[PDB]
Design a protein around this ligand. Sequence first.
Ligand SMILES: [Zn+2]
Ligand SMILES: [Zn+2]
Ligand SMILES: [Zn+2]
Lengths: 51, 271, 48, 91, 51, 97, 154, 48, 96, 21, 234, 67
Amino acid sequence: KAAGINIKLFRRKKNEMDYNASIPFEKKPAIGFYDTSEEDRQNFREKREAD
Amino acid sequence: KQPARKQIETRPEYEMEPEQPGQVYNLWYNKWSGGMRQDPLKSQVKSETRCVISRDSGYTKADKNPGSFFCLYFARGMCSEGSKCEYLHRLPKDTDFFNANVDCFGREKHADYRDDMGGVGSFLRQNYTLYVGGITPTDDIEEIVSRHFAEWGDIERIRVLNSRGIAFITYLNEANAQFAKEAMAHQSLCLNVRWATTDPNPASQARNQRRLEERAANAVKKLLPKQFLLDLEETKNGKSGNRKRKLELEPSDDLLYADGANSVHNQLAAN
Amino acid sequence: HRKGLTYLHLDYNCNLKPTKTLTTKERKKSRFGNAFHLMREILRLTKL
Amino acid sequence: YNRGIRDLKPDYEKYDKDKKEEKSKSRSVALYDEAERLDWVSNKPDKEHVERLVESIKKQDQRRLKNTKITFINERNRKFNLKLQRFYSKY
Amino acid sequence: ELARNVPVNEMVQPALGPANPFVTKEQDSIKNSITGYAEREYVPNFVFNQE
Amino acid sequence: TKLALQKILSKQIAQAVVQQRDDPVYIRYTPSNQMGQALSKQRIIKMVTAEQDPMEPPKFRHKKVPRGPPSPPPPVLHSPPRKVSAQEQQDWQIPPS
Amino acid sequence: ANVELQTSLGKILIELYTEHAPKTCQNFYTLAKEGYYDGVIFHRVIPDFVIQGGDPTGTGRGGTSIYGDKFDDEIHSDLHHTGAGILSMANAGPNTNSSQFFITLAPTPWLDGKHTIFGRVVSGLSVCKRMGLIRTDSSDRPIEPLKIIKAVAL
Amino acid sequence: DVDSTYIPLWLKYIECEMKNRNINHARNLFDRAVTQLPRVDKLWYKYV
Amino acid sequence: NLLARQFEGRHSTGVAKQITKQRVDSHQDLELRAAVMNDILDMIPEGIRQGKSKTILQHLSEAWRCWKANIPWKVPGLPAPIENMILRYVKSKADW
Amino acid sequence: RSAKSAGNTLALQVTSSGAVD
Amino acid sequence: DVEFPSICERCLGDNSYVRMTKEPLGQECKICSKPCTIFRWIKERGQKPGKTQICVGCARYKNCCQSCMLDLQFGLPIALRDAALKLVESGPTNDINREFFAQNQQRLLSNGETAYDSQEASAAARNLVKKVEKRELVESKQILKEARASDASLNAGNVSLSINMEPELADYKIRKHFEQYGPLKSVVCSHRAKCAFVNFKTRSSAEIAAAASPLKVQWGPEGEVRNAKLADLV
Amino acid sequence: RVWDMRTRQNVHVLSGHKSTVASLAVQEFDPQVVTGSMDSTIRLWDLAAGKTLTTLTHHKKTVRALS
Ligand SMILES: [Zn+2]
Ligand SMILES: [Zn+2]
Ligand SMILES: [Zn+2]
């Protein structure tokens, strides 16, 4: 990459879920009496930009 | 405007034994096993044959069928049945939309998209561009591939790497894109034609996604209510408050631009 | 042949003979059970 | 909990204003009634309170990390010998 | 599975509601499957065939 | 309970005899306004179970899946905890072996 | 004329327009007096449209007025759905009002025809605003029983 | 899900939610925790 | 069975393995350890830092070895209930 | 307004006069 | 009672009367990787029979057609729907996670609540078309002559160009523009360089096309963009 | 686990606990199977569907006796 690269990509083996496409088991928090609403949807920009 | 002609008079028969000492046929998996893996890409004879629309396209028995498909043997250029064949011997046009399930080339599309991206793409993604690799003779690679690719279909974007013989031509329709992908493999410009992967450019990703929204908009606008379609341009090409009063007498987005029985427009007309 | 055991030769008299010297991995992979061998021998008798 | 209460600073300019303002026009139901109050579900605080929350939490975390921290061949053997010393030296 | 035999003239069966505008064409129809309604019928072979 | 257990037992036991159960079923079907258009006329279906080849082996592999999450835990509802004091905390302290 | 509705979410207070439409409020008043409305589900809830309820069977059909089956509505021009909270009645025909009713959450100027308006909610509007946010299945019906515990007339 | 009775995990989860200023999320989490283990006063004390 | 295993797979998970005269000892030990874990989890009262099972198991193993070699096995700091339970299980194992 | 029920329904005035459930 | 698979009438044939067969456990769901029954019928006499490819759990969680996978409300590929419309989050692409999501979603979705309402679908369609219509509407001197003279010799505040007669926008737009100015051979272009070079069968067509001049032009990767920045100072 | 006497088949797998099911009890009226385990939790199952109806978490330590 310093002088001129062919864009080297790291090699994954053939039998892993890769843990990098989605949540490994995809469980969401239970919804309760108090509505989240804005607490995450007002700040989707924050979910991306703190990252 | 003339009937299609067969390209090859003969039939390509199968008789060949790689690596005479160290290969043995496999009855179940119909190919030769044993011997050195030899290579992942080395094997790649060059299409002995090649087709072009000018001298080859024409009428065939499948033109009568409305939903008929294109010859697997035409694009690689050895369809030997001529006009008698059961598939189209012509070039796909603009209005040739097919089923999402059936490959626009007649094949079927799976979901996992493989690892070599070899034969037919997946249905969970729609990529209009294809990786074509091969020779890198001089600086005129862009023009030669353009010459060799325009005749296959409508082209959108040609981006050929100058350092190495790598190109990422983007087509306009799936039919022409996949027809050219299948029809240019192992040809002279052998060519390693494959399916392109996700483009890492956030700008290219952005513009590709915007193009997906505009394609969606062109698809759906024939389905929206006629009143919504006329408001689309009366808002941008006319005043607002003059007709807001007619709306005021009898004002939400979902309440107004909604079809189905018992809607506000049907109730107003029923009175 | 749906086992990859293409180096084993089943002659027309129903004898399982390898076509080449086998490593330990191939020898352990190419070990069949009593069902296959019993059926092969019954087939050999029928062919006789 | 009562240590945390001992480190609390209540009674800002907010609470007295809230007690005095909406109580004047109490046509029905009291601002302090909670038998059938509805508005307590939607209390979204201000920035200052959340800020002091974060600083109190961070200070408490730092306080915890601050207070929390040859017969032997290795450091684990050492820790084991000190454990042994703690239990058997009496006997 | 109406278990009570009942006369005809009370078979109008009205919804008794303002007949919500908000419903769209995709909700005007009652169905079991996602595409539409389907239910058992004892058609003899010959009539179905010839028609 | 007898009916349910008998049903589950017959289902489990049913998993070599060649299956011979072929008889058409007819079903009255109604389409519903998918993409606007003008709906479509009512249809009925002739429905026949295609018979399987007796020699056909198992069609496909079976792949294990990690067990899904359980129902969320119920409340605990314990009696109020008792006090043990440091003395009894010490009397239950075990030495290393 | 005044009726308190001890609903499950909270408290609904309604004043009946006896001076405007007398016939349609007398049945409601005497119906709150009898109080057979105890344990009746609010079977219909449409976000920003209505909350309908009032039938003993709970299937969205039926309900007997004092007249027994149905009565004739009375409407006049100054009645309108310009606001959010107007208490009106329910019907399934030209003059087919039954024991159920509903509460408006939005201006509905198209609905002021064959439909009678007979109430204005003076307090408990917050309760209706939250009723607009109730769990609803495919049909406009709450999953959990949205009963009314009991109703006094006052 | 592995073990909902581990109070240190609940407390750690609460603190980690509050570090990033998600308040209503943490209030929902407390409601779940207090309706799950009503007889432990650590959760109640943190809540109040 | 051969063709089913060929076209389906092992289905190794979720299968039981009978005790076959070679796993007898290694299964009896597992059952004894599980029983002792249950007894530990019970006799220790509430809020007494239950994470003490492994050390008591080590004590039990040492007591068994001392019994085999005919050694008194007096542990000074061990509480009385733990000592009694260990003695009881050691006697059970010895009788077997 | 398109929020739907993003949260659980609020506690109920139970029929036993219990204020909040 | 395992009654029907959901298929749209576009691929159910134009006959109101069709016959179909089922083969239980005949295929693995191409999404669920689950044992599912197949259904075969004939759209119209004279074409290859169709068949369902995805289970009943899918095409319902996706509100799609089991055979053609066109969405049952709009009628364009479900992949393009979920990519451009973006109603609700989709699943992963890897095997174990995709099957896990499919299984748990089918479970929590058969519990009774529907994951797809068409009101929000139409709302998002109109929102997308609205965004589309919204879309529809001394340092400079030193980077100017730094390399133009170099290439010109090698192979040949305001700046005003010269017009010579020496003898987002895709390439097909160029193709249907020069067709009336003479036959086309090939149009090589590049968005970054913004330079589109065309070729004709005869130079006469090129010169007559170029005579129409009074946005237009007349005659490494970054190395070709040096003159494209002139567009900022054109 | 629920066994059929005649056919030796395992019809139901009452899997709801987290640890050893130290206790058991069966009767004719629903709920039929009552299982108490090392989680100090008692469960009441229904044999028709093989699911749990109620969970009784009042116990602090493992419930070793049901009667
Ligand atoms: Zn052909
Ligand atoms: Zn379809
Ligand atoms: Zn599926």
